[PDB]
Amino acid sequence: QALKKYTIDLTERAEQGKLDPVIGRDEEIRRTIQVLQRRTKNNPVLIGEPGVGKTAIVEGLAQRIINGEVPEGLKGRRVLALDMGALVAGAKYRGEFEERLKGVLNDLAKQEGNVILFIDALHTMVGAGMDAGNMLKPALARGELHCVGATTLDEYRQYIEKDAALERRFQKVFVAEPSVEDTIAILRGLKERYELHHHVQITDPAIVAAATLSHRYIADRQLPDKAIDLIDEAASSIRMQIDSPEELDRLDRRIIQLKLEQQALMLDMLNEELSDKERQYSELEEEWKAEKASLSGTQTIKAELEQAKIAIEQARRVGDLARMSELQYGKIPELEKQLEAATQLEGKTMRLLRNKVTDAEIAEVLARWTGIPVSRMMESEREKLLRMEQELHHRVIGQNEAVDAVSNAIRRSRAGLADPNRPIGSFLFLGPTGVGKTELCKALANFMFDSDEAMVRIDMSEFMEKHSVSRLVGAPPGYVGYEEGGYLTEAVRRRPYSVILLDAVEKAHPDVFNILLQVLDDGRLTDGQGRTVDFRNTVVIMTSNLGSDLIQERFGELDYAHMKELVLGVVSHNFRPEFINRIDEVVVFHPLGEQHIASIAQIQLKRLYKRLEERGYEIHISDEALKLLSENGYDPVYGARPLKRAIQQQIENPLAQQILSGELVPGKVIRLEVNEDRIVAVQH
Amino acid sequence: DLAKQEGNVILFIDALHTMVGAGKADGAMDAGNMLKPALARGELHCVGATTLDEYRQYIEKDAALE
Ligand SMILES: Nc1ncnc2c1ncn2[C@@H]1O[C@H](COP(=O)(O)OP(=O)(O)OP(O)(O)=S)[C@@H](O)[C@H]1O
Ligand SMILES: Nc1ncnc2c1ncn2[C@@H]1O[C@H](COP(=O)(O)OP(=O)(O)OP(O)(O)=S)[C@@H](O)[C@H]1O
Numbered sequence: 001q002a003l004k005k006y007t008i009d010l011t012e013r014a015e016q017g018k019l020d021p022v023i024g025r026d027e028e029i030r031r032t033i034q035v036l037q038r039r040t041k042n043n044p045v046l047i048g049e050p051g052v053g054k055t056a057i058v059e060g061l062a063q064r065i066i067n068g069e070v071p072e073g074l075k076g077r078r079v080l081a082l083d084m085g086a087l088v089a090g091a092k093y094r095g096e097f098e099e100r101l102k103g104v105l106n107d108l109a110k111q112e113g114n115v116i117l118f119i120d121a122l123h124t125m126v127g128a129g130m131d132a133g134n135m136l137k138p139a140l141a142r143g144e145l146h147c148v149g150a151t152t153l154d155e156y157r158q159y160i161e162k163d164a165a166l167e168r169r170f171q172k173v174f175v176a177e178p179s180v181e182d183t184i185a186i187l188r189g190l191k192e193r194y195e196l197h198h199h200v201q202i203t204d205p206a207i208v209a210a211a212t213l214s215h216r217y218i219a220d221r222q223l224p225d226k227a228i229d230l231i232d233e234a235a236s237s238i239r240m241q242i243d244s245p246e247e248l249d250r251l252d253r254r255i256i257q258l259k260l261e262q263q264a265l266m267l268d269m270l271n272e273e274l275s276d277k278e279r280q281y282s283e284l285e286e287e288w289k290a291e292k293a294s295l296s297g298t299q300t301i302k303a304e305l306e307q308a309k310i311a312i313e314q315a316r317r318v319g320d321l322a323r324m325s326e327l328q329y330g331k332i333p334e335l336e337k338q339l340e341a342a343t344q345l346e347g348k349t350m351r352l353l354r355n356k357v358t359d360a361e362i363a364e365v366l367a368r369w370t371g372i373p374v375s376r377m378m379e380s381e382r383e384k385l386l387r388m389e390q391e392l393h394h395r396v397i398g399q400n401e402a403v404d405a406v407s408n409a410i411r412r413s414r415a416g417l418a419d420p421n422r423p424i425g426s427f428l429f430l431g432p433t434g435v436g437k438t439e440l441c442k443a444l445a446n447f448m449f450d451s452d453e454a455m456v457r458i459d460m461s462e463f464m465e466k467h468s469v470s471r472l473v474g475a476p477p478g479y480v481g482y483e484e485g486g487y488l489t490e491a492v493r494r495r496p497y498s499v500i501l502l503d504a505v506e507k508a509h510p511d512v513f514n515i516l517l518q519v520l521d522d523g524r525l526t527d528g529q530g531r532t533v534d535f536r537n538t539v540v541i542m543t544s545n546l547g548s549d550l551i552q553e554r555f556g557e558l559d560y561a562h563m564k565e566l567v568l569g570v571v572s573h574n575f576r577p578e579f580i581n582r583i584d585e586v587v588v589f590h591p592l593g594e595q596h597i598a599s600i601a602q603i604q605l606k607r608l609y610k611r612l613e614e615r616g617y618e619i620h621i622s623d624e625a626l627k628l629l630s631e632n633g634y635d636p637v638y639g640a641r642p643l644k645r646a647i648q649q650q651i652e653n654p655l656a657q658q659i660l661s662g663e664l665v666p667g668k669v670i671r672l673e674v675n676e677d678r679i680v681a682v683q684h
Numbered sequence: 685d686l687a688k689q690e691g692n693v694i695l696f697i698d699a700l701h702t703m704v705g706a707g708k709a710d711g712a713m714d715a716g717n718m719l720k721p722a723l724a725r726g727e728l729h730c731v732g733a734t735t736l737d738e739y740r741q742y743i744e745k746d747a748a749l750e
Contacts, residue, residue, distance in 0.1 A: 084717065088711065490740070494736065
């Protein structure tokens with residue numbers, strides 16, 4: 001007829017066990033059971049942030065009607081979830097949709113209030129072509145319909161609160177978003193379910209670490225949805241790593257390599273080596289099959305354990321006498337003890353291993369969701385990270401205080417000791433020009449992301465007027481670029497782990513520094529469209545040169561800390577104490593000596609050799625040429641750039657002059673031997 | 685016809701940004717309100733292929749399918 005075609009039951013799917021065990025939520029289940037049992041305004045709608053399981057509340061309502069802990073007025077009801085899909089999908093002719101909706105309402109009236117209708121996404125139903133606003137409002141008025149709604153907080157503002165005559169036939173059953181602890185409980189029930197499904201065993205410290213790390217690092221979505229996502233995705237990872245091994249991959253590639261080599265050689269010895277490696281391959285393959293058979297038997301017996309539990313729940317509802325004692329005291333202790341025998345057998349035989357989900361796989365799925373390096377240290381990465389100063393002294397020579405403070409900050413983030421209310425670090429680099437602020441920050445991005453300018457580099461010398469804050473926040477509502485956010489918040493909400501480099505910060509008007517007060521205090525920055533962005537995982541590096549005369553005047557015969565004190569007073573004269581209180585540590589650079597410039601000359605000549613060698617020419621140098629480049633490139637007030645433009649002149653002008661001249665032959669060695677006063681190439 | 689395959693078919697939508705609001709008219713279901721149930725229960729194995737700025741424009745304007 002009508003209530004068979006277009007509606008989907010929940011009480012059948014709560015009876016055949018197809019729905020999930022819904023834990024918690026007894027306050028909101030009780031409030032929905034209240035709102036259903038009134039005389040007017042009888043229809044509730046569930047309104048909450050998207051993800052907290054409004055549909056899960058109604059599925060749990062069906063499970064409590066079946067289990068019968070409801071009051072007597074709703075015992076024996078039927079919950080029919082409504083499908084707009086088929087209803088709209090059949091109506092080719094005019095009025096057929098209203099005919100079908102009228103037929104469904106007549107059969108609802110004929111079922112005489114015994115049916116609780118569940119329309120999820122009610123804002124979809126409100127527009128259907130009168131259509132559905134003017135047709136259910138009779139049954140929404142006279143209390144003969146017991147519709148239950150479920151909608152987002154967003155679409156309840158638009159598609160319902162537009163019209164008050166449809167708005168006040170409903171109730172804001174405001175589903176709260178659960179805290180950490182209720183998320184833990186929900187994950188325990190669904191641990192039971194997903195261990196049935198993905199053939200695994202979820203350790204309970206992985207549940208509490210999944211709850212905490214889902215609350216801390218993902219900030220897009222809403223609990224308890226993200227925690228079930230991390231648990232289910234890590235269980236998927238473990239099922240995949242079981243399903244594949246890698247040792248047999250090495251052995252198969254080795255035996256096919258030696259097989260091709262032996263077939264090419266047909267001294268031998270490789271028949272013997274191939275036979276030994278194929279015996280090793282067959283033994284490991286049989287061990288692989290034995291472990292797969294063991295896990296197969298264990299998960300089939302656990303599935304039979306759950307089928308016994310569903311059958312004993314059938315016996316708890318129905319009430320058979322000997323079936324209760326039979327199922328319980330026969331099936332449960334023997335199956336649980338040979339389950340534990342199979343579990344310790346897998347603890348004996350899993351070598352080749354992992355069939356359980358600890359915290360580490362949760363951390364790996366979290367580090368591949370967002371990008372924050374949460375995971376435990378594989379030893380390539382840990383020895384990579386202990387050599388952090390050794391990784392930065394190949395693109396920054398000198399400047400040890402900087403590399404110390406920076407490497408300290410990165411190490412404090414990767415261990416765990418960081419403060420989750422701040423970014424990792426927030427450095428205010430000072431010092432006169434051409435000593436390596438900007439290349440230190442590019443050295444960080446080259447370490448961390450394996451690319452030089454793969455980082456969010458904001459030029460703070462565009463913000464010389466007050467109205468250009470809005471380039472980085474974005475546009476307030478009802479203006480031009482409101483559809484397109486900022487530049488800072490968008491490119492961080494994409495990739496939460498980056499290095500935001502504020503280029504030469506002292507030029508801007510002080511308002512952008514007020515924006516930075518928000519950022520460096522609490523990692524949040526509400527952009528144009530009214531949403532926060534989690535900056536708790538970046539390294540907001542800000543450069544400057546506010547103490548050039550002071551540092552170039554007194555870095556001699558003054559230690560590091562007192563220099564920091566005196567330049568700290570100078571920056572206090574240029575900034576408000578709000579902003580420089582927020583800073584992690586102002587580190588101070590210093591102008592370069594002669595040997596530092598010699599090393600910089602060596603580095604720049606290395607990249608010049610790189611350029612001309614990928615061109616195809618090969619160049620050696622005399623040490624006297626390097627000494628002339630060191631002596632001409634030295635001056636304090638302009639930093640390490642007179643070295644680069646002296647190199648530019650005294651090599652790149654005559655050398656490019658002669659390479660374009662058709663003179664210098666490819667392949668031969670271009671020797672940069674000095675003249676009496678200059679540097680020139682020769683060819684022999 | 686994907687339910688009659690029993691999880692055998694990986695459905696590939698290209699331009700997932702397009703799908704939100706495909707058919708919105710006077711009497712419509714918007715094509716996101718017919719895949720929100722089927723995607724909600726995991727019965728469909730859809731694979732999305734969208735841009736990044738099309739993702740800011742089209743899907744995150746609609747959190748229930750985000
Ligand atoms: N308290 C809970 N107990 C058990 N499972 C829950 C709970 N909260 C959420 N879930 C699970 O979360 C998943 C989706 O929950 P839903 O409430 O259906 O999401 P939703 O409310 O439909 O969000 P939208 O905006 O409607 S898509 C299902 O797997 C539920 O079982
Ligand atoms: N300590 C250094 N080690 C290596 N290269 C350096 C060093 N200092 C400067 N350079 C070179 O000089 C350029 C970087 O100069 P920077 O010091 O970054 O200028 P800056 O730090 O922004 O100071 P200002 O604000 O520009 S005056 C690049 O070409 C580098 O190769």
